Design a protein around this ligand. Structure first.
Ligand SMILES: O=C(N[C@H]1COC(=O)[C@@H](NC(=O)c2cccc(O)c2O)COC(=O)[C@@H](NC(=O)c2cccc(O)c2O)COC1=O)c1cccc(O)c1O
Ligand SMILES: O=C(N[C@H]1COC(=O)[C@@H](NC(=O)c2cccc(O)c2O)COC(=O)[C@@H](NC(=O)c2cccc(O)c2O)COC1=O)c1cccc(O)c1O
Ligand SMILES: [Fe+3]
Length: 296
């Protein structure tokens, strides 16, 4: 039989007696993947409504419409609340290990309400994460279907586009802060670009970020002099940004000497690409096609 089944965490192996039917996600990031495979996620943590990466509820933009259609409940905005979770009467609770949406501090408390699992999204492809969530929820078939849909579009996409100059740097840029976070090869963003045939730029020395003690594997912070130093690719991709962000880079005196700037190879991928799940991955495909189709 399919249930019960054991799922192993960083906190050991746990028993899911039966298929979850009321999943609460304390990670707004994880929620996108849950929705993509039609898992019964009935409530989610949210970030700040109408901020750079979220909709009017604090949900991530790429699955905003889906959450509204399904009447997804919002647990809280920003600060995690164990009582809010309890009130949803979950039979499974998910927590992200890293990121601003991690409710890891409430692990012990949440653990008393329902079986509770800790998931990393900082160190694996969106497909890997989807597959893992499929095992957790009993929606393996759905996860495989979503991945197959993408694989078909990818096979066509790789044929349809001509790559810009390599290697490339992928970031999230914060214009008024004159800073960026640089996506690593391990990050979902990095793995996706590699899958599409891109080579990520190697970093200078002094650039390397501790990821001991379970610290995140997805980004390297670029503040101060590290900004110009870290944007060293021949092309530059801005996730979670659109044209005004690319134009801000093109106009920044601090960055004027960089090759991606001087060769006009700075590309915005969209505000809905802060986190990668099936929905935003498909968007990234479409955008790369719009930018790089041979015939353009
Ligand atoms: O100080 C922290 N945020 C700031 C400052 O961080 C930022 O300026 C940007 N941010 C990254 O570039 C980033 C690139 C790659 C990965 C990132 O996570 C980025 O944050 C944009 O983030 C934001 O727009 C918002 N962001 C989310 O809603 C979010 C939703 C779900 C999950 C999140 O992690 C979110 O940020 C609001 O957050 C913030 O602005 C902060 C500290 C410690 C660890 C954090 O993760 C922080 O975010
Ligand atoms: O680009 C925007 N800002 C700039 C310029 O804003 C600011 O420099 C500061 N901040 C205010 O001055 C502010 C005064 C009055 C009101 C403010 O909201 C201020 O933030 C510091 O904020 C931060 O550095 C970062 N950000 C958070 O960590 C955050 C974490 C939790 C919650 C936050 O709001 C955060 O900003 C990066 O943000 C930016 O630097 C920007 C865009 C879209 C929506 C935004 O909210 C932005 O601020
Ligand atoms: Fe964050």
């Amino acid at each position: 039989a399919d249930w019960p089944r054991q799922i192993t965490d960083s906190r050991g192996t746990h028993t899911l007696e039966s298929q979850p039917q009321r999943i609460v996600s304390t990670s707004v990031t994880l929620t996108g993947s849950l929705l993509a495979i039609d898992a019964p996620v009935i409530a989610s943590g949210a970030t700040t409504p109408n901020n750079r990466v979220a909709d009017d509820q604090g949900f991530l933009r790429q699955w905003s419409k889906v959450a509204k259609e399904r009447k997804l409940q919002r647990l809280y905005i920003g600060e995690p609340s164990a009582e809010a979770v309890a009130a949803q009467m979950p039979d499974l609770i998910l927590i992200s290990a890293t990121g601003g949406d991690s409710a890891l501090a409430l692990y012990d408390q949440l653990s008393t309400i329902a079986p509770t699992l800790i998931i990393n999204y900082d160190d694996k492809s969106w497909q890997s994460l989807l597959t893992q969530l499929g095992e957790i929820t009993g929606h393996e078939k759905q996860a495989a279907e979503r991945i197959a849909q993408f694989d078909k579009q990818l096979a066509a996409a790789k044929e349809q586009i001509k790559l810009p100059p390599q290697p490339v740097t992928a970031i999230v840029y914060t214009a008024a802060a004159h800073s960026a976070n640089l996506w690593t090869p391990e990050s979902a963003q990095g793995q996706m670009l590699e899958q599409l045939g891109f080579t990520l730029a190697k970093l200078p020395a002094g650039l390397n970020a501790s990821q001991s003690q379970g610290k995140r594997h997805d980004i390297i912070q670029l503040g101060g002099e590290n900004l110009a130093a870290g944007l060293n690719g021949e092309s530059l991709f801005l996730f979670a940004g659109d044209q005004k962000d690319a134009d801000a880079i093109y106009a920044n005196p601090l960055l004027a000497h960089l090759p991606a700037v001087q060769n006009k190879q700075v590309y915005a991928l969209g505000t809905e690409t802060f986190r990668l799940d099936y929905y935003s991955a498909m968007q990234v495909l479409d955008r790369l096609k719009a930018l790089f189709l041979e015939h353009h």
